[PDB]
Amino acid sequence: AAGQNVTYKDYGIKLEFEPRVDDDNNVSMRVLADVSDIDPATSVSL
Amino acid sequence: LATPSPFDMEKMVWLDVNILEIRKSVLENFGVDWSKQIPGPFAAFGKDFV
């Protein structure tokens, strides 16, 4: 609501891995890969 | 007594996407621009009879 509460946002290199493996060593997986940097151009002063 | 596989090997699909865009524009502004509303004539009369 409203128009306080401070949270935190992560930037950098982030990686998440969730593997599953078969009897023939086949790998079924979900992977999240993120590379994120701060940009001066689109920052707002408030 | 049979058991299932942990998962099933699925087929893998490759997607290739193309987006193409072209924009063109022309802008011209030429000539002489004059006034269109100008003051006109005036007349006034005034007298004191008494």
mmCIF file of C-alpha atoms in Angstrom:
data_model
loop_
_atom_site.group_PDB
_atom_site.id
_atom_site.type_symbol
_atom_site.label_atom_id
_atom_site.label_comp_id
_atom_site.label_asym_id
_atom_site.label_seq_id
_atom_site.Cartn_x
_atom_site.Cartn_y
_atom_site.Cartn_z
ATOM 1 C CA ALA A 1 0.000 0.000 0.000
ATOM 2 C CA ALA A 2 0.864 3.674 0.606
ATOM 3 C CA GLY A 3 2.113 6.456 -1.646
ATOM 4 C CA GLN A 4 9.206 2.272 5.318
ATOM 5 C CA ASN A 5 10.098 -1.284 4.289
ATOM 6 C CA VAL A 6 13.572 -2.034 2.940
ATOM 7 C CA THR A 7 14.244 -5.210 0.972
ATOM 8 C CA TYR A 8 17.390 -6.291 -0.843
ATOM 9 C CA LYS A 9 17.866 -7.210 -4.500
ATOM 10 C CA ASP A 10 20.652 -9.484 -5.743
ATOM 11 C CA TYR A 11 22.942 -8.677 -8.641
ATOM 12 C CA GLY A 12 26.024 -10.425 -9.984
ATOM 13 C CA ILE A 13 26.399 -13.961 -11.251
ATOM 14 C CA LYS A 14 23.605 -16.237 -10.050
ATOM 15 C CA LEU A 15 23.293 -19.929 -10.834
ATOM 16 C CA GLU A 16 20.719 -22.558 -9.831
ATOM 17 C CA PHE A 17 20.994 -26.276 -10.586
ATOM 18 C CA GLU A 18 18.485 -29.138 -10.188
ATOM 19 C CA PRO A 19 19.733 -32.437 -11.640
ATOM 20 C CA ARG A 20 18.318 -35.952 -11.973
ATOM 21 C CA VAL A 21 20.336 -38.937 -13.186
ATOM 22 C CA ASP A 22 19.494 -42.185 -14.990
ATOM 23 C CA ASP A 23 21.159 -45.601 -14.971
ATOM 24 C CA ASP A 24 22.990 -44.733 -18.206
ATOM 25 C CA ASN A 25 24.256 -41.445 -16.729
ATOM 26 C CA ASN A 26 21.786 -39.337 -18.673
ATOM 27 C CA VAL A 27 21.105 -36.059 -16.916
ATOM 28 C CA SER A 28 17.728 -34.314 -16.871
ATOM 29 C CA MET A 29 18.084 -30.874 -15.422
ATOM 30 C CA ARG A 30 16.796 -27.373 -14.878
ATOM 31 C CA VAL A 31 19.394 -24.606 -14.856
ATOM 32 C CA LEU A 32 19.024 -20.887 -14.218
ATOM 33 C CA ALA A 33 21.940 -18.693 -15.310
ATOM 34 C CA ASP A 34 21.882 -14.948 -14.647
ATOM 35 C CA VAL A 35 24.511 -12.233 -15.097
ATOM 36 C CA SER A 36 23.400 -8.785 -13.998
ATOM 37 C CA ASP A 37 25.233 -5.503 -13.456
ATOM 38 C CA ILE A 38 24.245 -2.055 -12.221
ATOM 39 C CA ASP A 39 23.598 0.550 -14.922
ATOM 40 C CA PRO A 40 24.091 4.286 -14.335
ATOM 41 C CA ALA A 41 21.979 5.232 -17.356
ATOM 42 C CA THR A 42 18.630 3.958 -16.069
ATOM 43 C CA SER A 43 18.986 4.708 -12.347
ATOM 44 C CA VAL A 44 16.498 7.119 -10.762
ATOM 45 C CA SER A 45 17.366 9.533 -7.963
ATOM 46 C CA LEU A 46 13.972 9.603 -6.180
ATOM 47 C CA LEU B 1 7.576 -56.610 -9.898
ATOM 48 C CA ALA B 2 8.773 -54.282 -12.639
ATOM 49 C CA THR B 3 9.798 -50.746 -11.770
ATOM 50 C CA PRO B 4 9.558 -47.554 -13.835
ATOM 51 C CA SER B 5 12.462 -45.441 -14.969
ATOM 52 C CA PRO B 6 13.294 -42.372 -12.858
ATOM 53 C CA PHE B 7 12.346 -40.205 -15.826
ATOM 54 C CA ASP B 8 11.947 -40.472 -19.582
ATOM 55 C CA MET B 9 14.506 -39.139 -22.012
ATOM 56 C CA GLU B 10 12.661 -36.607 -24.145
ATOM 57 C CA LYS B 11 13.671 -35.255 -27.519
ATOM 58 C CA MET B 12 15.449 -31.915 -27.583
ATOM 59 C CA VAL B 13 14.285 -29.080 -29.843
ATOM 60 C CA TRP B 14 16.289 -26.157 -31.207
ATOM 61 C CA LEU B 15 14.472 -22.915 -32.014
ATOM 62 C CA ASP B 16 15.957 -20.290 -34.328
ATOM 63 C CA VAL B 17 14.159 -16.928 -34.441
ATOM 64 C CA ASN B 18 14.754 -13.938 -36.720
ATOM 65 C CA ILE B 19 13.263 -10.464 -36.300
ATOM 66 C CA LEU B 20 14.009 -7.912 -39.019
ATOM 67 C CA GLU B 21 12.878 -4.298 -39.087
ATOM 68 C CA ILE B 22 13.452 -1.220 -41.259
ATOM 69 C CA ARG B 23 12.128 2.313 -40.702
ATOM 70 C CA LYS B 24 12.404 5.260 -43.070
ATOM 71 C CA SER B 25 11.125 8.814 -42.854
ATOM 72 C CA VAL B 26 11.248 12.185 -44.614
ATOM 73 C CA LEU B 27 10.234 15.571 -43.220
ATOM 74 C CA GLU B 28 10.092 18.827 -45.218
ATOM 75 C CA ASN B 29 8.937 22.316 -44.241
ATOM 76 C CA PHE B 30 9.300 25.064 -46.817
ATOM 77 C CA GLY B 31 7.797 28.361 -47.906
ATOM 78 C CA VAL B 32 6.811 31.737 -46.497
ATOM 79 C CA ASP B 33 4.218 32.066 -43.735
ATOM 80 C CA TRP B 34 2.413 35.425 -43.490
ATOM 81 C CA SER B 35 -0.030 37.003 -41.064
ATOM 82 C CA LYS B 36 -3.681 36.081 -41.480
ATOM 83 C CA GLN B 37 -5.440 38.468 -39.071
ATOM 84 C CA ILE B 38 -4.611 42.170 -39.136
ATOM 85 C CA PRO B 39 -6.269 45.264 -37.619
ATOM 86 C CA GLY B 40 -8.860 47.044 -39.714
ATOM 87 C CA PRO B 41 -10.052 50.632 -40.055
ATOM 88 C CA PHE B 42 -11.459 52.636 -37.158
ATOM 89 C CA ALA B 43 -13.868 55.549 -36.794
ATOM 90 C CA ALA B 44 -14.966 57.572 -33.779
ATOM 91 C CA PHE B 45 -17.317 60.506 -33.237
ATOM 92 C CA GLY B 46 -17.901 62.632 -30.161
ATOM 93 C CA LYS B 47 -19.876 65.778 -29.430
ATOM 94 C CA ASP B 48 -21.362 67.883 -26.625
ATOM 95 C CA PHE B 49 -24.630 69.485 -27.719
ATOM 96 C CA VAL B 50 -25.192 71.228 -24.374
#
